[PDB]
Structures are given as C-alpha cells and as structure tokens.
Design a protein around this nucleic acid. Structure first.
Lengths: 27, 219, 283
RNA sequence: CAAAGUCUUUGGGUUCUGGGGGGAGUAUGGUCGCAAGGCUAAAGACGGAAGGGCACCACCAGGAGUGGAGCCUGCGGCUUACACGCGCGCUACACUGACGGAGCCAGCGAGUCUAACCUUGGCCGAGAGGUCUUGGUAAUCUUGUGAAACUCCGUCGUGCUGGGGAUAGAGCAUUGUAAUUAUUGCUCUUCAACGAGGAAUUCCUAGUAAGCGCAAGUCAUCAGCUUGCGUUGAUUACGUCCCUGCCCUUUGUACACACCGCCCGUCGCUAGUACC
RNA sequence: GUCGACGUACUUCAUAGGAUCA
C-alpha cells in the first residue's frame, strides 16, 4: 500500500512539473 | 488471439480432459483432483501408479486427448499444477494456493456439469491473452443460451482467482450461489514443448530475484 | 462523422459551460464519450441524445462500474423528432447539418435552457455573431439576436479533427433571453423575410415586388374580413390602397430609404409597429 | 526558349515592384474595433408429464484405509522478554513374525580450474571417524550405484518376550568460533503406550489397490518434505439405474424397408361479440 | 470577455540520393 501511494504521488508530481515547463515557454 | 496451437482446432472440436497426480497422492489431494474433475465437462480421470511419463503421455496421445492436467502437493494439500496441451502444445506450470472443498463446507446442491458459461476478467497483456486462450480452449465449445454454470477467472494483481457460481434470473436481477473451489492461482512458466521434451522452447519464466517484480505484473 | 481528437479543447468547452452541481445537462450527439464523462462529474443528471446504437452501446459500456453509472440516460432517434425533457444547459457537437434547426428548436422550447455551448461551422457562427452593418448581418442574425444572445468563445481550427475536414469550427455560447420578448414570432419573421431578400438594396425596394404586394393585399383583406369591414373601390385590385399605405409608412418612419442590412433591431420594431398601426400583418 | 539568346563575371534608353515560398500553431505593457440583461418558474411468461443416455456426488462386490497408540506436521484457542479444536503422514501393535549368517535383480541422473566436487584402493579405528592416490569435467570413475522388500537355513516361542522403541543418561567420534538448546553419526544403558481401534470415515476397477528401496533438490511450493526413478504385486466391478443427481425430445422432422400417427395444464399479445 | 482584424515576437512540419555488400 505504501509502495503504490508513493508511485501515484511521484508520477503526478513529476508530470505536473514537466507540464508547467510546457506551460511557460511557447508563450 | 487464437494461436497455431489452436487455429486448426479452436472452435472446430470440443475437448476432453484427463486428471492425474504426480506420485502416490494423499487422500485429500485425490479428493481435490475429484473436485477439479467434476467441475470440468468431458471429465475422465486415471490414477498414475508407477508410470514412466514419456510412456504415459505418449500412450495417452495416440488414444486421443486434447489436454492433460497433473497436480502436486505438500504434505496433504496441493500447491502446483500443470497443463499439457497434447498436439505439441504449450505446457503451463502454475502455483495454486487456496481452496474450498465441497466435501468440507456443505452439500450446496449439485455441480450439474452442464457445458458451462465462461468468464475471463481483466486480462490485458499478451501473456493474459495466452492464458485466456489456453484456458478457454479447455472448456466445452457450446454452452446454451442460458447455461447457468458460470466459471469465473479474475486477473487482479497477477493472482488469477477462479470460482463457480450458479445463477437464476430472478425478478430484478440474477441471483448466484457459490460452488466449486475458490483459488489463488499463479503461473511461473510456459513451455511450447510438451512436458515429454524436458528441454524444449520455454516461452516464459517468472523472474523472481528481480527487484521490480515486487511491483510489475507479467514479468 | 468527425472526431474532436484534441484532449484540451474538450475540457475548455466543458468548464466554460459553468455547470452547477444541480444541473440537468442535455448533451446532444455525445460521440464516443470523449466529452461526456466530464459532464458526468459536474452535473447531477445527464440526458444524452444519440442516433447510432453502436455509439450508444459503446458509450453505455464506458460507464460501467464507474460511480457515475446511474446518472446518464440515453434517448435514441432523430433529434429533430423527439420530445426533449426539461434540461437545464445544453452542450452540443452534432454534425453540422442540423445547426440551423437546433438553434431555433432551443429558442422555441417550453422553458428553454439557460446557457448552451454549441459547436458550429466558422461562417455559420460568424453569421450568428454579427452586429448590424457588418458584411455578414443576415436574416438569421436578426432572428437569433432578437430572441437570444450569442457570444464567441474560441476558434477550433480544423486540425483537431479526425479526419481533418475543410472548414474551420467555432465554439459559441448561446443564452436565451428571459422572459422571451413579447413581439410575435410569425410577424417578426414575415417582416424579416420580406425586407432581407436583397440585403443591400434599400427597404422600399423590397416592397415593390408583385409577389409581395399580392401577399400584403391578401393579408389586408383577410384582416378586414376578420373584423368584417367591407371593402372600397380599388383601381387595380386592393393593393392600390395598400400601395399608398405602404408609401405613407415609408415616409413617416423614414425607413423607406435606409438599407435593411444596416438597420438594427429597434428600426425593425418601429417598422413593425407602423405597419401594425395602419392595418397590415405578415402572417 | 528565335527570346527566357548577345563568345566564362555582367554598362543601348527608361518606368514599376520584391527583400523572401507552402502547411499548422502560441504569445501579446501595441493599434483599431465588438454584446445582452433586471421580473420570470417543468415533474410471450409460469407449473407438470412421458420418452432415451450418465455417475466409486448412484446401486453390487470387496481392496486399502483413517478415526486406537506413539511421533512429525497444514488451518483454528491463548500468550510471551502453555490444560487446547479441525486435518495430512510414518512407525508398530508380532510367527506370512523377530534376530544370525548365505545368495541376489534396477533405473533416474549428479559430480570438481586456478578449485577440491564426485570418486577407487590399500590403511588403521567396534563403529563413528582420519591416510595418499588415480578415474571423471563425464557411458569411461561412482556406475553393474552388488538397493530394499525378496529368497534359504539357523535362533526363538506368543511370551505386552527376543514384537515395540516413544523415554532418558553416559561415553565416543564429528564439526563449528562454539552442538550449549541430546545440530549430526556410532556405542552402551532406560524399555512407555501399543492385545486391531467405536460413531463415522475417504479412495479405488490391472502392472490396479498395496508394499519395497535408489536419485535430485534445477528463479514458484518443498527438507523428519517434494518430485523423479525403478522393484514386488494382488481380490472384486467390468454388470445395473433401485435411490440419488446430470444430459438429450415432445412436429421422430431428417429421404425407401419393420413402429406409432396432437406434449399437457395456468396468466398471457391481439381479434370478434351479448352487456352496461 | 479564455472576443475579432491587424502590428510585433516566436515555434513547428516537411531531407535524403546513387553504388557495392548482406
């Protein structure tokens, strides 16, 4: 249960940060 | 997907089964073999006593048989299983864990052994496809429009679990009763060579001391 | 049949609709539910209208085991022949040949919606959102701008579509006036049909055709015969009287010289009232 | 292409235009523009009948049992930094027996290079255990694994004895850093229950039940277990539907020759019509 | 107002051809 909840936290946080750096640049 | 192990024979001919055991079963293991016999249609069984397996399987092959299941145990209760599809088909070697016994609990009616209804739940990867096709080609082709014997395979968390349930289409929905055993079934190898080879093409082995197999399904 | 593949215009269409947690969405032409499931999250109860039972079967397969499984009805058949239930906003992708029926069916509902997010072909939408005096001010704009109000949202360019079609699309928020105003419908439409036949000739031009003077003479006679006031001497047939009658209006309200594709809505009102005042009706 | 030519890089006069094409996009401290609204309110289905096949979940015959003992062991109580409920196995409960010597028939594979495996012999030590060496990187050496039950005679008389060893203690090797918590192996000594096991109880139809040993632990399960390998080796059923339950039809529907020649009841769909 | 027409600024899509060998 620990290892799963870590995987969804890690995936969401990583993807969102890359999405912000996709949200800035071709502005 | 139908395979070269099944393409010429999938819906063409309905199969028969043979149930047997490794060497000198315990009595309860024989009783469980009886349960897995009476669950399957086209059910005929034969005790293995002092038999050379190449001779046994080779003699069973000219007589005509589609598949062969044979069991194992650990001091009374079974732990392992394998399926050998005869026409050069793939042997599959599983670890089975839990069981409920129709003898043990109650006489809850009858395993009517009608051509049953088939359920394969939550299989995605091509290995799930291999398991689905190999196991589907063991059931009878042609249950009726209202075959009340629903066999159930579930593939959550790499531990496929099987039950049997019997339903009646009651006023607002179906209603089911639990029969057959209930399982924690799990594979660990696929070999396209039949077990008489002992050395042929292994399709698949479960990596065990690989780290990520804590998490990952299907290797 | 085209498919809105872009997974980011879909969310924007949905959240501009301002769905409240107590709404009944009509969602016309759902497709394969690329769009629907967002509405299922945000509305109490969705009523999807569909014609392809292949799509209906797949769409109702999509919601199985999902918590939103019981908040979706499906109505089959032709959209322009059902009886829509009450619905409270409306979200629509439906293929464009019903774009002009759809709008008026929403305007003429009993208890119409409150906001609707509609997808249209670019030139169609630019008819709908064209103010008086533009190049595109048509009869459609004068109708729809009487009973509704129509506001652009975005451009959906043609490469968000599988397969890519040739025309660009628009997303448009339409919102019905409430109460609907108390001019008639059929008088408004009769007048607009006449004066918008040739959009840039002056208004007195449209009251010269002999089909039109036949129509107005017939209507004026039937109006007098509705009030049972017997008829005077006419040099041709009755349109004689009507002729000077029409001219007199187009002297007083001045409108017999302005060009109908530059006259905004109050001018059509003043013209409608002036013809009503002298005993002319359009249906 | 007779101009789109003017002997390799360029001048006969003069007017005009370009500063880079095509398809998609995104941003904006910029310029010009661009709405409507303030009173109005949905909720065909159901029960029954007969006709043919099926079952160590049926009948018949038994074989092996467990459930008795003792000991190991898989799911259930309670405790620690032990009076227990459901089950699987082995050993025996003795003259077809038990001990002394003689003879002896296998197969499966496994085994070691910069390590010591699997081995042969001779050696000594009751034994346990220590001696150097070749054979083998594999049919070669184990290995013919000279296996155990098996066969002969010997001893013994049914004796809870010599069947039986659960139970302890001591000594010996033997490791390992230590055995200490009898890790293991020999030896001596200790000699419990067990007099055939009720209610029940599972499996079983021939190389079968049953009994015996050898090999290996090859990514899952397994160590007083598992899976192979072979040995010896039987009785009764090979018949039945009486009960139990399962499957097939009710147009035999499918084409001469021999049979017969409506599936039945309840609520249905609709039609008709006497009635108000 | 995720408004339009511009004006600036930027992004992106379209690159392989012959010869020998396998």
């Amino acid at each position: 249960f620990e290892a799963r909840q870590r995987i969804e936290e890690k995936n969401k946080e990583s993807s969102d940060y890359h999405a912000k750096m996709a949200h800035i640049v071709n502005t | 997907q139908v395979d070269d192990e099944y393409a010429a024979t999938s819906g063409i001919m309905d199969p028969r089964i043979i149930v047997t055991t490794s060497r000198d079963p315990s009595t309860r293991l024989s009783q469980f073999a009886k349960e897995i016999k009476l669950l399957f249609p086209n059910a005929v069984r034969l005790n293995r006593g002092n038999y050379v397996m190449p001779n046994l399987v080779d003699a069973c092959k000219k007589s005509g048989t589609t598949d062969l299941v044979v069991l194992h145990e650990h001091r009374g209760v079974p732990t392992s299983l394998t399926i050998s599809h005869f026409p050069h088909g793939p042997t599959a070697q599983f670890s089975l864990h839990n069981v409920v016994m129709r003898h043990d609990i109650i006489n809850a009616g009858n395993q009517s052994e009608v051509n049953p209804h088939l359920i394969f739940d939550n299989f995605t990867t091509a290995l799930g496809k291999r398991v689905v096709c190999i196991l589907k080609h063991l059931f009878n082709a042609g249950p009726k429009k209202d075959s009340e014997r629903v066999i159930t395979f579930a593939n959550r968390g790499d531990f496929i679990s099987v039950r049997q349930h019997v339903y009646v289409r009651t006023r607002e929905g179906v209603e089911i009763a639990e029969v057959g055993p209930r399982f924690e079934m799990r594979l660990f190898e696929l070999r396209l060579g039949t077990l008489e080879n002992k050395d042929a093409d292994v399709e698949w082995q479960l990596r065990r001391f690989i780290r990520t197999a804590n998490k990952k399904d299907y290797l | 049949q085209h498919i809105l593949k872009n997974p980011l215009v879909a969310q924007g269409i949905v959240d501009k609709a301002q769905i409240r947690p107590s709404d009944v969405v009509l969602e016309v032409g759902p497709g394969t539910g690329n769009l629907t499931v967002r509405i299922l999250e945000q509305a109490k109860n969705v009523v999807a209208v569909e014609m392809d039972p292949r799509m209906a079967a797949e769409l109702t397969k999509r919601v199985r085991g999902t918590p939103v499984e019981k908040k979706l009805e499906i109505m089959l058949g032709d959209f322009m022949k059902t009886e829509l239930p009450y619905f409270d906003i409306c979200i629509s992708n439906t293929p464009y040949q019903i774009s002009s029926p759809l709008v008026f069916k929403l305007i003429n509902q009993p208890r119409p919606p409150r906001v609707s997010i509609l997808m249209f072909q670019r030139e169609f939408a630019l008819r709908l959102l064209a103010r008086p005096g533009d190049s595109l001010y048509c009869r459609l704009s004068a109708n729809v701008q009487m009973w509704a109000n129509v506001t652009h949202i975005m451009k959906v360019g043609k490469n968000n579509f599988r397969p890519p079609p040739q025309v660009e699309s628009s997303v448009v928020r339409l919102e019905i006036k409430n109460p609907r105003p108390q001019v008639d419908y059929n008088e408004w439409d009769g007048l607009l049909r006449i004066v918008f036949v040739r959009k840039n000739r002056t208004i007195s031009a449209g009251f010269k055709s002999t089909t039109v003077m036949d129509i107005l003479e017939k209507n004026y006679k039937t109006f007098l015969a509705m009030n049972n006031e017997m008829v005077d001497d006419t040099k041709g047939s009755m349109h004689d009287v009507v002729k000077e009658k029409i001219d007199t209006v187009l002297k007083e309200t001045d409108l017999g010289d302005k060009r109908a594709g530059k006259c905004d809505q109050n001018d059509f009102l003043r013209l409608l009232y002036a013809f009503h005042q002298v005993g002319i009706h359009f249906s």
